[PDB]
């Protein structure tokens, strides 16, 4: 009955915890030029 | 960004309260 409730909180946690996970590993994509017109920045 | 946790955690523990505030009341009852 309400043994579920509480359980429903423990949810979101995850949901954030899903979420930084996705988010940042993505972005990884420190030097990338094999040029000269690429190092030039 | 990290510090959501206690901001679940402290909310939990006032879901925590009510269910408690029922159930010793009910054992006042």
Do not use: H
């Amino acid at each position: 009955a309400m043994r579920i409730v509480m359980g429903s909180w423990w949810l979101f946690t995850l949901i954030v915890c899903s979420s930084y996970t996705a988010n940042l590993a993505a972005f990884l994509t420190p030097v990338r030029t094999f040029q000269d017109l690429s190092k030039q920045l | 960004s990290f510090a959501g946790v206690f901001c679940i955690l402290a909310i939990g523990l006032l879901l925590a309260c009510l269910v408690a505030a029922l159930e010793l009341w009910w054992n006042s009852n």
